[PDB]
Design a protein around this ligand. Sequence first.
Ligand SMILES: *[C@@H]1O[C@H](CO)[C@@H](O[C@@H]2O[C@H](CO)[C@@H](O)[C@H](O)[C@H]2NC(C)=O)[C@H](O)[C@H]1NC(C)=O
Ligand SMILES: NCCc1c[nH]c2ccc(O)cc12
Ligand SMILES: NCCc1c[nH]c2ccc(O)cc12
Ligand SMILES: NCCc1c[nH]c2ccc(O)cc12
Ligand SMILES: NCCc1c[nH]c2ccc(O)cc12
Ligand SMILES: NCCc1c[nH]c2ccc(O)cc12
Lengths: 391, 391, 391, 391, 391
Amino acid sequence: TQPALLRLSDHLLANYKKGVRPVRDWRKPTTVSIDVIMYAILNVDEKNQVLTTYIWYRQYWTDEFLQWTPEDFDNVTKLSIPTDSIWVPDILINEFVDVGKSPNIPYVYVHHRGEVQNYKPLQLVTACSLDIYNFPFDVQNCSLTFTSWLHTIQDINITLWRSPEEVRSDKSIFINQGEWELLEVFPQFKEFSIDISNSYAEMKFYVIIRRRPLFYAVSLLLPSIFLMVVDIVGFCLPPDSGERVSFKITLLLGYSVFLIIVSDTLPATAIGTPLIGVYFVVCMALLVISLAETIFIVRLVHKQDLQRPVPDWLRHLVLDRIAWILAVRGLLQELSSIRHFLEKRDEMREVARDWLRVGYVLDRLLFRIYLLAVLAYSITLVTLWSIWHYS
Amino acid sequence: TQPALLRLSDHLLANYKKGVRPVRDWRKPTTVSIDVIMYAILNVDEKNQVLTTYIWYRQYWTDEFLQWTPEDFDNVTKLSIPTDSIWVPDILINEFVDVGKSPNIPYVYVHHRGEVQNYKPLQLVTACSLDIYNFPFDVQNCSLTFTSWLHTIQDINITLWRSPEEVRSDKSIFINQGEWELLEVFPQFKEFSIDISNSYAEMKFYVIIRRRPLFYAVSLLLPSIFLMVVDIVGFCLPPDSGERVSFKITLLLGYSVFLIIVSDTLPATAIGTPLIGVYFVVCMALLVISLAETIFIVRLVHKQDLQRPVPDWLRHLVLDRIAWILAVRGLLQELSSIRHFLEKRDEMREVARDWLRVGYVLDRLLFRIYLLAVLAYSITLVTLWSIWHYS
Amino acid sequence: TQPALLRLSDHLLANYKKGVRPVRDWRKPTTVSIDVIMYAILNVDEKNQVLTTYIWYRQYWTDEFLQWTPEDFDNVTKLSIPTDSIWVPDILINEFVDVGKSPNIPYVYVHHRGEVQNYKPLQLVTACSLDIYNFPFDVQNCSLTFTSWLHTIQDINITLWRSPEEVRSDKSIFINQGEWELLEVFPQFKEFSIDISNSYAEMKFYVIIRRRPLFYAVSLLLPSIFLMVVDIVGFCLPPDSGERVSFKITLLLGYSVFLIIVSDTLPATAIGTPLIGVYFVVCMALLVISLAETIFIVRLVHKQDLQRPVPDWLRHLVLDRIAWILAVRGLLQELSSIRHFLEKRDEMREVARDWLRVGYVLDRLLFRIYLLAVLAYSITLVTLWSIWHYS
Amino acid sequence: TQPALLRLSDHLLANYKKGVRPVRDWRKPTTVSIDVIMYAILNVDEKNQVLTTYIWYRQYWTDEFLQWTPEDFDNVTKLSIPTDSIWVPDILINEFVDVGKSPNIPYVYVHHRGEVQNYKPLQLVTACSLDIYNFPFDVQNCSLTFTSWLHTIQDINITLWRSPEEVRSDKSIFINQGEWELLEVFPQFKEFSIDISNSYAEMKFYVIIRRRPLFYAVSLLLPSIFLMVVDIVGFCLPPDSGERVSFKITLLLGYSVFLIIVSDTLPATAIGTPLIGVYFVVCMALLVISLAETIFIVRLVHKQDLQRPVPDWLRHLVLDRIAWILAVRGLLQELSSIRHFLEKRDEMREVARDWLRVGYVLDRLLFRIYLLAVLAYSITLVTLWSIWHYS
Amino acid sequence: TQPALLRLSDHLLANYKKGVRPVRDWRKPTTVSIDVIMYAILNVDEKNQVLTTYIWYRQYWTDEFLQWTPEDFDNVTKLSIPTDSIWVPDILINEFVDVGKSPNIPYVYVHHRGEVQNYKPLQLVTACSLDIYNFPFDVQNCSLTFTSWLHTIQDINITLWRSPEEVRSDKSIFINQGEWELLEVFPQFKEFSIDISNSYAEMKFYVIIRRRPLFYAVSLLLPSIFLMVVDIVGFCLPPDSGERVSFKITLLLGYSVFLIIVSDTLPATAIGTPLIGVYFVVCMALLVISLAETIFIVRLVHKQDLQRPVPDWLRHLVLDRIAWILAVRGLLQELSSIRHFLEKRDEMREVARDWLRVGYVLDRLLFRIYLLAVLAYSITLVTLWSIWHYS
Ligand SMILES: *[C@@H]1O[C@H](CO)[C@@H](O[C@@H]2O[C@H](CO)[C@@H](O)[C@H](O)[C@H]2NC(C)=O)[C@H](O)[C@H]1NC(C)=O
Ligand SMILES: NCCc1c[nH]c2ccc(O)cc12
Ligand SMILES: NCCc1c[nH]c2ccc(O)cc12
Ligand SMILES: NCCc1c[nH]c2ccc(O)cc12
Ligand SMILES: NCCc1c[nH]c2ccc(O)cc12
Ligand SMILES: NCCc1c[nH]c2ccc(O)cc12
């Protein structure tokens, strides 16, 4: 006698004519209204200039083909019908490496005022620019864009639906102890035109994502502590001995092994320059210049050299002080010959005493240069931490 | 004359109207009833904060559009019809990296009471948090979530169908000799609301998965045995010789090679800190401080140094004791000169005898410090094993 | 006037009603009949506890909806119709990492007796347990399983169709010079029941796959030949010199480099323990205990030590024998002083002669221990080869 | 009373007959008109001779089945209908490794003049040849091709639609601070015929893509600065000592480690030869020839050798100058014997004085050879930079 | 008045009955006619015994359901209709790892004689055997196979359509400067039968693909040049000194590092044996036997040894020659004692003179053995190059 409410859906799906743009008047544009929220962001591999994310997407647009009345229809204000039989526009992410593995979920809402609602989960992995000027503290600024690809500015209207102050702080839905944390987003409207008389719609979502170097600080500052340890063990030894040389070549090789461990654990891109690794290579360069000085001291303690201290080295010293600062006859003859050979034997020692005073001064000079270099890098690190603390 | 039972399926599929929400009364919510079991869990790559699993999923929901009578229908209580022609809700896993490669299997059950049954195998690889505070013994706690994505709390009711005590212990179906073993799961009901007047359903499955370090114990405790072997071979040698130095630099390089073998075989994440590797780096730091002490002993056995034992080293010693604890004339002249040169020749030996007593005491002091460090780490390892044995 | 035979297919496809379970009587179960053959097996990556294969699958089941008569139909006993319009059950592989990239091939056979035939190529990559107790000779036992996922034991009957003796030896179709070779398979029937009054069908295919170590034998036995070469070059040298020490530290580092080359070329899993690498680490442990003995001999040739040979070393020796086994006065005074200093100069040599006899005996003792260890490992390797030759 | 404009779409979709080639006259070919723009190019992995890109594609073709009149149709000049119901040709990229993950976007334009418009985003990863003759400055020339795969030259006409001067410079739409930058493209028309009487259409897009070595210059020129540093520290030392040998073997090993760091960070292909790495291997070859010379000098300072300076070394020197350039008797006897033994003791020194003058000249000769080699490589590098600056 | 030609396609698609095997008489088999061409072959990763290719595929088969007349149909001899509405057989590649990412392109040709034409691009990555007996020159022989998977030998006839002499040389369509080049292909027909009374069709395409080692020759022959350089620097040094030992241990470690660089840049499979790397390991084995000889010479220059030259070493020498080839009394007493101690002091030198003549001869003997080994390997390399030049 009395059928169910499903015939009402037949009255919702009698003569719909799917495929046509749903408007009463054609020059009046239809209005879609969109919103986005970020549940949890996945990892950033960052080698391919790429980033991954997984967001929840809300939209609704006025369909105007469907009228419902509250009377005699058993008060079904909200009801779900499949999206494969109704109209849907094309809102797409751009600059993407591939489309995310998203489900279909064919259900959308219909109501009395005609508009159709849609919720969808979608993930996107896309190419975007990141700054690696400072490695442990990264800005990681990016921008996503949505557009009506096949429709124009008088075809589909873009509505953000929400006041930007509560868009600015959306931290109620976020996963704990993640590596990357978000601080604020910024919605704004633009337009891009390729040629004349063709203007298409564009919506953009500005994103600031931030990671803290809680793991990188302990694992990266302690190699600098090891640098200070090898610097202060390169301090108390006399420069004239070769034992510091035989230690420091193995120390340079072990330092290169430990730093290539750190740098292949964390490699960088071909676009940006990590200045921490650049300063590590500068330390390796200053250490091999120090090793050139070291083998100069190794050659300096030899007996045979032709070097000039009078014409120009005195000028360098003055410039430093100005800017920077019968058988008894045979018996006596043979014993005097023994005395002469013994005198030659301890005559060996006087040849190396003149050399030892010069190279120690030049070693202390280049040690002061390296100390000012380490102090300037410490000022640079404190300044970078203060700039990041300014935020 | 008499057709087959397939016309009965025509009576089951005459006027179904697929796509409408099947209810008699609209404000009365439909009830789905769900259950999950885990046949075998796949490997966890754990670098991407991700885990893989493969589970079997059971659900059934009251359709109410289909009535069957036991009389005159040849007693077909249970029969299979394809799922592409009937209604199905949307129950989805969240925080997933991609949807699993699952089959379609278009067959579902219909009965006399109206409800439709569904069995499906599904695998999911999803992002989840893991704790790497202690590397060989891992808690590996996680949580999965199912929800009605497009339906609300008065739309679809979630039913767990099974008493939680027999949910707590489900070990009848599990694969032997796997790396990861499960102990218990915990079903519970929650609700999340983003804004006002919008409350959606949520079901959560708590999972404890556990691996035993049967391979990691033998392969990780034996490097500590090698650490004790190199510690006790660093004990019996006299500190004044350079042979311990020339061995210990090669020993430190070989120890670094063997430990980078262990650590690139098992790397960690950028979020958590493996304290075993941290203690290995602490041992490398104490060994290079020991090497700084070692080259201090190498410089200590030289003849030329200006060090003060009287003003402050005696204060350090007191502080340690308080807190821690004619031709014959020419012949005689020349032979006396030979005696004088020979006296100088064995006068060389007395200059190095004063140094040798001090550095041995400081070496034994820092050896006691390292022994207390190894003993404290042994207490820490036994305490961690006891905490894991508490479970 | 006379149409073609395609109208016969219309008589085969007039009122089929796809989607219903095809039976005359419902409690009588339909019978599927299945068979499998393996054309070529792909590689096993074996790190993820996973294996890949590509097999050919034959099945046929009685449809009973389709009757053909040999009279007046131009003798079409066998004809092909698409499988998208007819019924098909669900026979699935389990414990799979993902479904194989298989084609569709929509053609199946129909005949006079009603049953429908199906041939399909399908590949599967699935998780399965492998034994790595012995690395070059692997058993590689596994089991695959097929089931009716949505049907019960009174719904679909499983038929193997072939006598198990000719299932046991199927080597006519196999690719030559592959790494993995199969020997026999074993078909058997089981049943698994999760809860009461619910019993589902199960078919299992037992598989023995085997690889020969023709590459691993030459590349793995020759490092043991190098171990015997370094053992016999560690034999003829006197232990008192440091030249064997300075060679053996570089030999241990080069041996570690060559063995990490072998072991990162062939790594193992986190579940099983490769005992060949375990014995390699045992050889490294015995070599560093030998190196501790070696530096004990290095300290043994020094002049200053306080060791006790009388109280306990004699007890150790007895235990080894029991279980294991005027101016002329000034001239004469000064020349006698020269004689005294020269007597002291060759008095240096007598202090080191007492030490040299003890450590050679202990070195030969630990060399006998290492020789018995290598001989026991040779017995173990011959025993393992004999156990594999037993098959 | 008055229906909407959707019935007009019914008048657009009444008797379309999708699947037929839309022409009035068959021998008159239909005309497609195409254009391409490059929004942002992705990274080039370049190991697989492959490159990735993401472009925007515009096309339109005359359909001629659809007539619209401006009168009485409410002025709908442009309207969107789905592309799944209308005709579309096959324009495909060739030599592709796989098809890009592109969306469907089922909407195309229809107008009064009959032609249908289509916009699509598509990415393609394809095999193409690149030149690695010079590593930091790469030409990276390539060519893409579009064709009508199933249609012939009298079937589909290809139209580029745009004047080639404004095709030549299209830099208004390009992403900033990318690694690869484009300069110009070149459109042209060709034709390929496999056999006789079969000629098919072809369109080709020539692409010049360019990367700047802003990261590679600083990271690659500074190893050459290190090469000059080790060259000038190999200058001031005397060749006769072994300290330069013991440094230079460790210097060669450290140089090989640093260069294998650079070369496994940036590897090359199996097709092209990177001449910078070739010159690095040439420097390693000249350094091991220098090391052979070095150990020749090491053997040169020994006392026992049989070498001929008279017959042929004088000829080599002339060729170099021409082209390149009672008891007292017992007392006296025994003291004369002491004099004879002391004379033998300082007779040791005269044997090594003759050798030292020759090898220094040959060392300076090969140092001049290496200096001319480094100077020629500097000329080569400046010439290559000038050729790239010519562009 | 006069409709278009699309109604003709309706006359082509009125009563087609898709899904039936199209024949007039059933026992007369339908004939497909196929051809293949290779545009460009992709890279071969060769670790997984796998190869990739991308080919163009041409086929046509007689449909016989469609008749066209040249009269009154406006001369449409060739026209395109979609392939989703017409019959298509199943021609598949076998032994494939996965199906290639191929497009759909739903357009096929129909004509007056009834047959339907099809062109398709398809790529396939498949498992196939390769020979690595000689590494730089590879045969790389393979075979592909096509078959009618679901049809028998009286169902579908295979036609190659082209004379085999012009199949033998098809080099008009091939990409320049690729790594792999093809020389000839060989078409032939076979048949495989699993059981009795079941014989299915098979077509096979034999492929010879060839790569030239233009990069491998320069990068692989120059390590052999380095082997000759280290061999000739191991020639001029005297064997009695330890300086050759201290160089050659570092030379062996550096040679192992350089060769593991070459061998992890180019690794091999677990099936085949690369004899170049085998000869490299043989050179390492002969060098460590040479190092055992070297440390035998190191022990040979010591003063304390008990070796027998008389009983058996003379027999070895004969076998080599046969097959291979008052106070004055106190003064005189004390000065004679000084003479005796001085006589003992230069009595040290005579003990080491007897040893030095033997080990040089044995060193030259093993050097001749290594020279014959290098000469035999040179003969082997020239012979392998001549065998490859025979082709
Ligand atoms: C299809 O082609 C045939 C072959 O040319 C056409 O037959 C001839 O067409 C010419 C062109 O006008 C006439 O002059 C001849 O008289 C035709 N032959 C005969 C026997 O009448 C045929 O007309 C073409 N079909 C159509 C529709 O034009
Ligand atoms: N799981 C319920 C879906 C859901 C809840 N809140 C949401 C907010 C936005 C969105 O796209 C989706 C949602
Ligand atoms: N072959 C059917 C497997 C099976 C048996 N019982 C089950 C229960 C739930 C489920 O998802 C699956 C199953
Ligand atoms: N994003 C809107 C589509 C669009 C704008 N400009 C374009 C240029 C070319 C093209 O294929 C497409 C477009
Ligand atoms: N543009 C069509 C390419 C093409 C030309 N001739 C061909 C022959 C065979 C084939 O598969 C493809 C082709
Ligand atoms: N070309 C058909 C291959 C084939 C021959 N015999 C078979 C038997 C079973 C099977 O799945 C496949 C086959």
